[PDB]
Design a protein around this ligand. Structure first.
Ligand SMILES: [Mg+2]
Ligand SMILES: [Mg+2]
Ligand SMILES: [Mg+2]
Ligand SMILES: [Mg+2]
Ligand SMILES: [Mg+2]
Ligand SMILES: [Mg+2]
Ligand SMILES: [Mg+2]
Ligand SMILES: [Mg+2]
Ligand SMILES: [Mg+2]
Ligand SMILES: [Mg+2]
Ligand SMILES: [Mg+2]
Ligand SMILES: [Mg+2]
Ligand SMILES: [Mg+2]
Ligand SMILES: [Mg+2]
Ligand SMILES: [Mg+2]
Ligand SMILES: [Mg+2]
Ligand SMILES: [Mg+2]
Ligand SMILES: [Mg+2]
Ligand SMILES: [Mg+2]
Ligand SMILES: [Mg+2]
Ligand SMILES: [Mg+2]
Ligand SMILES: [Mg+2]
Ligand SMILES: [Mg+2]
Ligand SMILES: [Mg+2]
Ligand SMILES: [Mg+2]
Ligand SMILES: [Mg+2]
Ligand SMILES: [Mg+2]
Ligand SMILES: [Mg+2]
Ligand SMILES: [Mg+2]
Ligand SMILES: [Mg+2]
Ligand SMILES: [Mg+2]
Ligand SMILES: [Mg+2]
Ligand SMILES: [Mg+2]
Ligand SMILES: [Mg+2]
Ligand SMILES: [Mg+2]
Ligand SMILES: [Mg+2]
Ligand SMILES: [Mg+2]
Ligand SMILES: [Mg+2]
Ligand SMILES: [Mg+2]
Ligand SMILES: [Mg+2]
Ligand SMILES: [Mg+2]
Ligand SMILES: [Mg+2]
Ligand SMILES: [Mg+2]
Ligand SMILES: [Mg+2]
Ligand SMILES: [Mg+2]
Ligand SMILES: [Mg+2]
Ligand SMILES: [Mg+2]
Ligand SMILES: [Mg+2]
Ligand SMILES: [Mg+2]
Ligand SMILES: [Mg+2]
Ligand SMILES: [Mg+2]
Ligand SMILES: [Mg+2]
Ligand SMILES: [Mg+2]
Ligand SMILES: [Mg+2]
Ligand SMILES: [Mg+2]
Ligand SMILES: [Mg+2]
Ligand SMILES: [Mg+2]
Ligand SMILES: [Mg+2]
Ligand SMILES: [Mg+2]
Ligand SMILES: [Mg+2]
Ligand SMILES: [Mg+2]
Ligand SMILES: [Mg+2]
Ligand SMILES: [Mg+2]
Ligand SMILES: [Mg+2]
Ligand SMILES: [Mg+2]
Ligand SMILES: [Mg+2]
Ligand SMILES: [Mg+2]
Ligand SMILES: [Mg+2]
Ligand SMILES: [Mg+2]
Ligand SMILES: [Mg+2]
Ligand SMILES: [Mg+2]
Ligand SMILES: [Mg+2]
Ligand SMILES: [Mg+2]
Ligand SMILES: [Mg+2]
Ligand SMILES: [Mg+2]
Ligand SMILES: [Mg+2]
Ligand SMILES: [Mg+2]
Ligand SMILES: [Mg+2]
Ligand SMILES: [Mg+2]
Ligand SMILES: [Mg+2]
Ligand SMILES: [Mg+2]
Ligand SMILES: [Mg+2]
Ligand SMILES: [Mg+2]
Ligand SMILES: [Mg+2]
Ligand SMILES: [Mg+2]
Ligand SMILES: [Mg+2]
Ligand SMILES: [Mg+2]
Ligand SMILES: [Mg+2]
Ligand SMILES: [Mg+2]
Ligand SMILES: [Mg+2]
Ligand SMILES: [Mg+2]
Ligand SMILES: [Mg+2]
Ligand SMILES: [Mg+2]
Ligand SMILES: [Mg+2]
Ligand SMILES: [Mg+2]
Ligand SMILES: [Mg+2]
Ligand SMILES: [Mg+2]
Ligand SMILES: [Mg+2]
Ligand SMILES: [Mg+2]
Ligand SMILES: [Mg+2]
Ligand SMILES: [Mg+2]
Ligand SMILES: [Mg+2]
Ligand SMILES: [Mg+2]
Ligand SMILES: [Mg+2]
Ligand SMILES: [Mg+2]
Ligand SMILES: [Mg+2]
Ligand SMILES: [Mg+2]
Ligand SMILES: [Mg+2]
Ligand SMILES: [Mg+2]
Ligand SMILES: [Mg+2]
Ligand SMILES: [Mg+2]
Ligand SMILES: [Mg+2]
Ligand SMILES: [Mg+2]
Ligand SMILES: [Mg+2]
Ligand SMILES: [Mg+2]
Ligand SMILES: [Mg+2]
Ligand SMILES: [Mg+2]
Ligand SMILES: [Mg+2]
Ligand SMILES: [Mg+2]
Ligand SMILES: [Mg+2]
Ligand SMILES: [Mg+2]
Ligand SMILES: [Mg+2]
Ligand SMILES: [Mg+2]
Ligand SMILES: [Mg+2]
Ligand SMILES: [Mg+2]
Ligand SMILES: [Mg+2]
Ligand SMILES: [Mg+2]
Ligand SMILES: [Mg+2]
Ligand SMILES: [Mg+2]
Ligand SMILES: [Mg+2]
Ligand SMILES: [Mg+2]
Ligand SMILES: [Mg+2]
Ligand SMILES: [Mg+2]
Ligand SMILES: [Mg+2]
Ligand SMILES: [Mg+2]
Ligand SMILES: [Mg+2]
Ligand SMILES: [Mg+2]
Ligand SMILES: [Mg+2]
Ligand SMILES: [Mg+2]
Ligand SMILES: [Mg+2]
Ligand SMILES: [Mg+2]
Ligand SMILES: [Mg+2]
Ligand SMILES: [Mg+2]
Ligand SMILES: [Mg+2]
Ligand SMILES: [Mg+2]
Ligand SMILES: [Mg+2]
Ligand SMILES: [Mg+2]
Ligand SMILES: [Mg+2]
Ligand SMILES: [Mg+2]
Ligand SMILES: [Mg+2]
Ligand SMILES: [Mg+2]
Ligand SMILES: [Mg+2]
Ligand SMILES: [Mg+2]
Ligand SMILES: [Mg+2]
Ligand SMILES: [Mg+2]
Ligand SMILES: [Mg+2]
Ligand SMILES: [Mg+2]
Ligand SMILES: [Mg+2]
Ligand SMILES: [Mg+2]
Ligand SMILES: [Mg+2]
Ligand SMILES: [Mg+2]
Ligand SMILES: [Mg+2]
Ligand SMILES: [Mg+2]
Ligand SMILES: [Mg+2]
Ligand SMILES: [Mg+2]
Ligand SMILES: [Mg+2]
Ligand SMILES: [Mg+2]
Ligand SMILES: [Mg+2]
Ligand SMILES: [Mg+2]
Ligand SMILES: [Mg+2]
Ligand SMILES: [Mg+2]
Ligand SMILES: [Mg+2]
Ligand SMILES: [Mg+2]
Ligand SMILES: [Mg+2]
Ligand SMILES: [Mg+2]
Ligand SMILES: [Mg+2]
Ligand SMILES: [Mg+2]
Ligand SMILES: [Mg+2]
Ligand SMILES: [Mg+2]
Ligand SMILES: [Mg+2]
Ligand SMILES: [Mg+2]
Ligand SMILES: [Mg+2]
Ligand SMILES: [Mg+2]
Ligand SMILES: [Mg+2]
Ligand SMILES: [Mg+2]
Ligand SMILES: [Mg+2]
Ligand SMILES: [Mg+2]
Ligand SMILES: [Mg+2]
Ligand SMILES: [Mg+2]
Ligand SMILES: [Mg+2]
Ligand SMILES: [Mg+2]
Ligand SMILES: [Mg+2]
Ligand SMILES: [Mg+2]
Ligand SMILES: [Mg+2]
Ligand SMILES: [Mg+2]
Ligand SMILES: [Mg+2]
Ligand SMILES: [Mg+2]
Ligand SMILES: [Mg+2]
Ligand SMILES: [Mg+2]
Ligand SMILES: [Mg+2]
Ligand SMILES: [Mg+2]
Ligand SMILES: [Mg+2]
Ligand SMILES: [Mg+2]
Ligand SMILES: [Mg+2]
Ligand SMILES: [Mg+2]
Ligand SMILES: [Mg+2]
Ligand SMILES: [Mg+2]
Ligand SMILES: [Mg+2]
Ligand SMILES: [Mg+2]
Ligand SMILES: [Mg+2]
Ligand SMILES: [Mg+2]
Ligand SMILES: [Mg+2]
Ligand SMILES: [Mg+2]
Ligand SMILES: [Mg+2]
Ligand SMILES: [Mg+2]
Ligand SMILES: [Mg+2]
Ligand SMILES: [Mg+2]
Ligand SMILES: [Mg+2]
Ligand SMILES: [Mg+2]
Ligand SMILES: [Mg+2]
Ligand SMILES: [Mg+2]
Ligand SMILES: [Mg+2]
Ligand SMILES: [Mg+2]
Ligand SMILES: [Mg+2]
Ligand SMILES: [Mg+2]
Ligand SMILES: [Mg+2]
Ligand SMILES: [Mg+2]
Ligand SMILES: [Mg+2]
Ligand SMILES: [Mg+2]
Ligand SMILES: [Mg+2]
Ligand SMILES: [Mg+2]
Ligand SMILES: [Mg+2]
Ligand SMILES: [Mg+2]
Ligand SMILES: [Mg+2]
Ligand SMILES: [Mg+2]
Ligand SMILES: [Mg+2]
Ligand SMILES: [Mg+2]
Ligand SMILES: [Mg+2]
Ligand SMILES: [Mg+2]
Ligand SMILES: [Mg+2]
Ligand SMILES: [Mg+2]
Ligand SMILES: [Mg+2]
Ligand SMILES: [Mg+2]
Ligand SMILES: [Mg+2]
Ligand SMILES: [Mg+2]
Ligand SMILES: [Mg+2]
Ligand SMILES: [Mg+2]
Ligand SMILES: [Mg+2]
Ligand SMILES: [Mg+2]
Ligand SMILES: [Mg+2]
Ligand SMILES: [Mg+2]
Ligand SMILES: [Mg+2]
Ligand SMILES: [Mg+2]
Ligand SMILES: [Mg+2]
Ligand SMILES: [Mg+2]
Ligand SMILES: [Mg+2]
Ligand SMILES: [Mg+2]
Ligand SMILES: [Mg+2]
Ligand SMILES: [Mg+2]
Ligand SMILES: [Mg+2]
Ligand SMILES: [Mg+2]
Ligand SMILES: [Mg+2]
Ligand SMILES: [Mg+2]
Ligand SMILES: [Zn+2]
Lengths: 107, 51, 64
RNA sequence: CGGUAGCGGGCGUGGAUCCCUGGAUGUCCGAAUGGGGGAACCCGGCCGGCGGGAACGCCGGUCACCGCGCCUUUUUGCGCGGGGGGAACCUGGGGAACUGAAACAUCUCAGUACCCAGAGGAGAGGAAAGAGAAAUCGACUCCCUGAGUAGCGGCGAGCGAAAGGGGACCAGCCUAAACCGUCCGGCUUGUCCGGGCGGGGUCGUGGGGCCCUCGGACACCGAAUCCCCAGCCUAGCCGAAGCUGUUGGGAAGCAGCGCCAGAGAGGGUGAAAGCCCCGUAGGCGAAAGGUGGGGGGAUAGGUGAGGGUACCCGAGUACCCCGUGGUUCGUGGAGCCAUGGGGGAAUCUGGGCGGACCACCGCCUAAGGCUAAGUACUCCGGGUGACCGAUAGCGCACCAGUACCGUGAGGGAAAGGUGAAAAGAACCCCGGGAGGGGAGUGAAAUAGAGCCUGAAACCGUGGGCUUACAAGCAGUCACGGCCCCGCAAGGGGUUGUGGCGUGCCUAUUGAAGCAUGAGCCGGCGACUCACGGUCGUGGGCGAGCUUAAGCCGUUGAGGCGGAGGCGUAGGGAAACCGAGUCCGAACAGGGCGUCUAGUCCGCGGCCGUGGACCCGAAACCGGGCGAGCUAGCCCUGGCC
RNA sequence: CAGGCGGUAGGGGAGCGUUCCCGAUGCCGAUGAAGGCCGACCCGCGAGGGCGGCUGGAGGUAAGGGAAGUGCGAAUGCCG
RNA sequence: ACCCGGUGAAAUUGAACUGGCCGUGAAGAUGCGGCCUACCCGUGGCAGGACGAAAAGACCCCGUGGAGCUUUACUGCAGC
């Protein structure tokens, strides 16, 4: 029974805390084992790389460091506000995620 | 001592007997309503003893 | 564990109402042919143990 | 697509990884089971298969032993079963010594440690040849009590019951024998004997058999056995409510206004979050497997009253004796239960027992077996701590029963922490490298990986004061000088000369002692706890005080429970009498008593028993491990 | 006001500090917890307790009570 | 052995700013007294002292300690 991530790739989410409090981005990737997410263009850092086949000019590269999955919040496709995931059993059977604020389907 | 404890609270005046709590059908806000009326604004701690 | 009564004391001695400790006079078990009547008589009685040894014996009879 | 990045390739809404349930596969060793063997390797028989397959090899199957059914033509076959492991707990067979007794032998330690066999989630025990004094109880086990009583005891050290009462649990059954039936065998041929099977039978108001009489045989009871179900376990799921401002590297902080609450447990998130995340309260959940001590169904089974008869009612048994064990019982007046030896009955008008023996009065029915629950334990799962926090807590938080030591049995460590995030320092410079200096990342690099904090011993660099005609437990008092902080006056550091000056601990009549202990620093390090006593003390109640186990409630809530314990009477070896009583002929005289105060809880001091303030023997005992060193011998070789 | 106040074994009395509990869903804390390093300062007879500067970086625990693995310099102690 | 380059232990160690004489003192003093002597620091050497190191004296005694051995010590067991 895997880690219970409240957000998937690539949801559109709000970086709700940290240095990037306020930013908005698509969930580029999820890392459940480490309980983290990577949001595009967020939490970027200046990694040094030795001169290589890949990096002949060497120097630095930029890359998005994973944020703690907790710091990130799903945004509603409907009301556009950041929300809290809510579970809703459909008519037929299998369940979906819905916006606790309004009620819209998160998809 | 049990009698003596209720006594200390009697003399202070901080003992109140009620025959029933009216609005409370189960929810916390219901008690909060009722408590307001008994003058339990929650500026002081309360032991609530009831079956 | 709980204390045991010293049966040796229990068989030789008594605690009176006030906690005095009495025993039989020693010295009459035998060799009496030449003991005077007075001596055999006076040894027939009980006597109260001296306080120090008395209070040691009372400790030995704790449920007494 | 484990820890795990890397190189190199894949998979997933056609529902992957992952979690649960049930399958499949499962080399070799191990009870180890075809045989051998120095475990993990070596060699086979029978039957099939494979390769060109005769030889050779591989593959599949099969072949150990013991017990019972002997169903087996003994031979031969078949069938069910056993073996080995398990943390502790359990029963049984055997069974120490140190120690205590201030020596020691009886005794104690103790039927303990330990060895061995066996049982199972428990095991043991268990439906009276009981208890033991009441005209009583009614299987066993477990807890409280009775009780440190009765007793046992070099009557020393010490040991130490039972009945009764209060509770937990609750449950009772099957046979042997008479007698009927049948079946194979006997040859003393038979109303006979023996073995098997079925029926019958199950006892202490004594029962049962067989013959006679009424009843009912369709009434009733009813599993500990079987069937079904609820419920439970082994994956999961739903689950209320926060915005904005602000300081900050970061908000959960501060400020403003809100909301939820059967949820304000807790953990996480860059710091301190009921409303961000996982959750929490409250609910919902299984196709499959396990359980099912609750609910329902069935089956096995089980049930009367008289009269007669005198057929049966567990044998080397009871019983007696000798030698012992058990019990509180140590030979004691020594019963009772058990039995190694000898003698050796009876079938109810019989036997055993109520502490020698006898009489009386009673209790019980031996010499066959089964039985749940209440109880014990903790390898394992969960929950919780006025439990530990890396020298602690398990030996082990980490690659630990490891490294290492030891022939072996066996011994047995040390070792946790960058950061919120690897952003883990490109690039330049010195250098063979190591290591550094710039740069860069970060809030912080005096977080740089030999990474949080970073004390002390210990080692250096720099500065102030000081020191080469003074001899000293190293300090101290004074004065003076220099350097420093100070408006002032005052102070800090250092020490030239003057005064005075026998380290610390322990052990001691006495130590600076040429008596003991300590290189120095850091950390670990010794009067506790339980039960029972005796005083003091803070309280509660008072001629009364008080509950124990347990039951109910809770889930950091208490209540119930009076059995029992102390006290309200003492004296006496006792019978016994009683404000008295004992010795005594006493109506002398003495002794011990009377002339009320206790009891429960907490705290403190001390005492008894426990290792009892901590560390230390030489030794004694149990069970294993060692003749790869050494001693001797046995077998087979070699050397001079 | 008067008198007493050397002290080993030992007896008595009053306190200081360590860990933990209640007090706490509290209060202190990144405007800096604990711990560390200094000090010629304050309070206390003393054990101590404060205050200030530096370090440190996430905890702390009041008044009043409760409980103990509670204080080291020596054990040819133990570990480093 | 000594000197230079390289590597680099140990027992021991309360701390030391560690002189002689005559006294003294638990009776054998670098450490107490009074005198005498001595500029500061080393290197190669000798062993008189530090009652030098090492080993909680093996001698001796003590402990109602241990063990091995003996016998016409006591009690017991095997064996006969
Ligand atoms: Mg960066
Ligand atoms: Mg929600
Ligand atoms: Mg005792
Ligand atoms: Mg005795
Ligand atoms: Mg005696
Ligand atoms: Mg007396
Ligand atoms: Mg005479
Ligand atoms: Mg006389
Ligand atoms: Mg007295
Ligand atoms: Mg007493
Ligand atoms: Mg691993
Ligand atoms: Mg990988
Ligand atoms: Mg791998
Ligand atoms: Mg690779
Ligand atoms: Mg690649
Ligand atoms: Mg599916
Ligand atoms: Mg295997
Ligand atoms: Mg074999
Ligand atoms: Mg086989
Ligand atoms: Mg072989
Ligand atoms: Mg062959
Ligand atoms: Mg074969
Ligand atoms: Mg046949
Ligand atoms: Mg046969
Ligand atoms: Mg046969
Ligand atoms: Mg079969
Ligand atoms: Mg078995
Ligand atoms: Mg076995
Ligand atoms: Mg047996
Ligand atoms: Mg045994
Ligand atoms: Mg046996
Ligand atoms: Mg002995
Ligand atoms: Mg003793
Ligand atoms: Mg002894
Ligand atoms: Mg002794
Ligand atoms: Mg003992
Ligand atoms: Mg035995
Ligand atoms: Mg016993
Ligand atoms: Mg035992
Ligand atoms: Mg069970
Ligand atoms: Mg049981
Ligand atoms: Mg059970
Ligand atoms: Mg059982
Ligand atoms: Mg049985
Ligand atoms: Mg039985
Ligand atoms: Mg009966
Ligand atoms: Mg009797
Ligand atoms: Mg009666
Ligand atoms: Mg009677
Ligand atoms: Mg009666
Ligand atoms: Mg009767
Ligand atoms: Mg004894
Ligand atoms: Mg006894
Ligand atoms: Mg005994
Ligand atoms: Mg005995
Ligand atoms: Mg007993
Ligand atoms: Mg008896
Ligand atoms: Mg009883
Ligand atoms: Mg009762
Ligand atoms: Mg009972
Ligand atoms: Mg119970
Ligand atoms: Mg019953
Ligand atoms: Mg039958
Ligand atoms: Mg028979
Ligand atoms: Mg015939
Ligand atoms: Mg015939
Ligand atoms: Mg048959
Ligand atoms: Mg039969
Ligand atoms: Mg029959
Ligand atoms: Mg029958
Ligand atoms: Mg009878
Ligand atoms: Mg009859
Ligand atoms: Mg009859
Ligand atoms: Mg008739
Ligand atoms: Mg009739
Ligand atoms: Mg009728
Ligand atoms: Mg009917
Ligand atoms: Mg049933
Ligand atoms: Mg499951
Ligand atoms: Mg569940
Ligand atoms: Mg949820
Ligand atoms: Mg929620
Ligand atoms: Mg603030
Ligand atoms: Mg809660
Ligand atoms: Mg709480
Ligand atoms: Mg927020
Ligand atoms: Mg979860
Ligand atoms: Mg939970
Ligand atoms: Mg609950
Ligand atoms: Mg509900
Ligand atoms: Mg739930
Ligand atoms: Mg199912
Ligand atoms: Mg099922
Ligand atoms: Mg299962
Ligand atoms: Mg069960
Ligand atoms: Mg089921
Ligand atoms: Mg049932
Ligand atoms: Mg039916
Ligand atoms: Mg029937
Ligand atoms: Mg009948
Ligand atoms: Mg017979
Ligand atoms: Mg016989
Ligand atoms: Mg007999
Ligand atoms: Mg006998
Ligand atoms: Mg026996
Ligand atoms: Mg005996
Ligand atoms: Mg016994
Ligand atoms: Mg006996
Ligand atoms: Mg006797
Ligand atoms: Mg006897
Ligand atoms: Mg008899
Ligand atoms: Mg016997
Ligand atoms: Mg016999
Ligand atoms: Mg007879
Ligand atoms: Mg006869
Ligand atoms: Mg009879
Ligand atoms: Mg009897
Ligand atoms: Mg009798
Ligand atoms: Mg007789
Ligand atoms: Mg009887
Ligand atoms: Mg029987
Ligand atoms: Mg049983
Ligand atoms: Mg567990
Ligand atoms: Mg647990
Ligand atoms: Mg702690
Ligand atoms: Mg450590
Ligand atoms: Mg640490
Ligand atoms: Mg460490
Ligand atoms: Mg360590
Ligand atoms: Mg463990
Ligand atoms: Mg690990
Ligand atoms: Mg490991
Ligand atoms: Mg281990
Ligand atoms: Mg391991
Ligand atoms: Mg070693
Ligand atoms: Mg890390
Ligand atoms: Mg970390
Ligand atoms: Mg660098
Ligand atoms: Mg270079
Ligand atoms: Mg080279
Ligand atoms: Mg830099
Ligand atoms: Mg920089
Ligand atoms: Mg910073
Ligand atoms: Mg800095
Ligand atoms: Mg690293
Ligand atoms: Mg790392
Ligand atoms: Mg390193
Ligand atoms: Mg290195
Ligand atoms: Mg270090
Ligand atoms: Mg350092
Ligand atoms: Mg300079
Ligand atoms: Mg200097
Ligand atoms: Mg001069
Ligand atoms: Mg001076
Ligand atoms: Mg001057
Ligand atoms: Mg100058
Ligand atoms: Mg200067
Ligand atoms: Mg200065
Ligand atoms: Mg100034
Ligand atoms: Mg100035
Ligand atoms: Mg001045
Ligand atoms: Mg000065
Ligand atoms: Mg000076
Ligand atoms: Mg001066
Ligand atoms: Mg001087
Ligand atoms: Mg002196
Ligand atoms: Mg010493
Ligand atoms: Mg002296
Ligand atoms: Mg000395
Ligand atoms: Mg001397
Ligand atoms: Mg000496
Ligand atoms: Mg000495
Ligand atoms: Mg030392
Ligand atoms: Mg030392
Ligand atoms: Mg020394
Ligand atoms: Mg050393
Ligand atoms: Mg201590
Ligand atoms: Mg003491
Ligand atoms: Mg004490
Ligand atoms: Mg203590
Ligand atoms: Mg006590
Ligand atoms: Mg007294
Ligand atoms: Mg008291
Ligand atoms: Mg009182
Ligand atoms: Mg009790
Ligand atoms: Mg409840
Ligand atoms: Mg309960
Ligand atoms: Mg709790
Ligand atoms: Mg709790
Ligand atoms: Mg209770
Ligand atoms: Mg009692
Ligand atoms: Mg009489
Ligand atoms: Mg009388
Ligand atoms: Mg009178
Ligand atoms: Mg008379
Ligand atoms: Mg007279
Ligand atoms: Mg008179
Ligand atoms: Mg007189
Ligand atoms: Mg009189
Ligand atoms: Mg009088
Ligand atoms: Mg009176
Ligand atoms: Mg009077
Ligand atoms: Mg009185
Ligand atoms: Mg006491
Ligand atoms: Mg004693
Ligand atoms: Mg000991
Ligand atoms: Mg003690
Ligand atoms: Mg004691
Ligand atoms: Mg011995
Ligand atoms: Mg020996
Ligand atoms: Mg061997
Ligand atoms: Mg050899
Ligand atoms: Mg040869
Ligand atoms: Mg030759
Ligand atoms: Mg004080
Ligand atoms: Mg709290
Ligand atoms: Mg708190
Ligand atoms: Mg809270
Ligand atoms: Mg407060
Ligand atoms: Mg900050
Ligand atoms: Mg501030
Ligand atoms: Mg600061
Ligand atoms: Mg310093
Ligand atoms: Mg200052
Ligand atoms: Mg002051
Ligand atoms: Mg304070
Ligand atoms: Mg202060
Ligand atoms: Mg700072
Ligand atoms: Mg600080
Ligand atoms: Mg932090
Ligand atoms: Mg406190
Ligand atoms: Mg505070
Ligand atoms: Mg306080
Ligand atoms: Mg306090
Ligand atoms: Mg309190
Ligand atoms: Mg306190
Ligand atoms: Mg301690
Ligand atoms: Mg010490
Ligand atoms: Mg030391
Ligand atoms: Mg040493
Ligand atoms: Mg060491
Ligand atoms: Mg050492
Ligand atoms: Mg260490
Ligand atoms: Mg050391
Ligand atoms: Mg030379
Ligand atoms: Mg040279
Ligand atoms: Mg050299
Ligand atoms: Mg010095
Ligand atoms: Mg001399
Ligand atoms: Mg001198
Ligand atoms: Mg010296
Ligand atoms: Mg002097
Ligand atoms: Mg001198
Ligand atoms: Mg030189
Ligand atoms: Mg040299
Ligand atoms: Mg020289
Ligand atoms: Mg010399
Ligand atoms: Mg020696
Ligand atoms: Mg000699
Ligand atoms: Mg001794
Ligand atoms: Mg002696
Ligand atoms: Mg002696
Ligand atoms: Mg000797
Ligand atoms: Zn919405």
């Amino acid at each position: 029974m895997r880690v219970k991530m409240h957000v998937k790739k690539g949801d559109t989410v709000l970086v709700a805390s940290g240095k990037y409090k306020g930013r908005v981005g698509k969930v580029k990737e999820v890392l459940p084992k480490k309980y983290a997410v990577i949001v595009e263009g967020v939490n970027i850092v200046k990694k040094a790389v030795r001169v290589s086949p890949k990096y002949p000019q060497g120097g630095f590269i930029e890359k998005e460091a994973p944020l703690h999955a907790s710091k990130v919040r799903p945004i509603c496709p409907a009301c556009g506000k950041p929300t809290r995931v809510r579970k809703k059993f459909l008519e037929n059977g299998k369940k979906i995620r819905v916006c606790a604020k309004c009620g819209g389907a998160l998809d | 001592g049990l009698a003596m404890a209720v006594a200390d609270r009697a003399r202070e005046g901080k003992l109140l007997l009620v025959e029933a709590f009216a609005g409370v059908n189960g929810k916390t806000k219901e008690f909060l309503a009722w408590a307001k009326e008994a003058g339990l604004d929650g500026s002081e701690s309360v032991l609530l003893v009831t079956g | 564990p709980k204390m045991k009564t010293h049966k040796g004391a229990k068989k030789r001695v008594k605690i009176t109402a006030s906690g005095k400790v009495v025993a039989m006079k020693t010295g009459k078990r035998h060799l009496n042919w030449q003991k005077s009547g007075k001596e055999i008589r006076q040894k027939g009685r009980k006597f109260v143990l001296a306080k120090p040894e008395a209070e040691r014996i009372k400790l030995l009879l704790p449920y007494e």
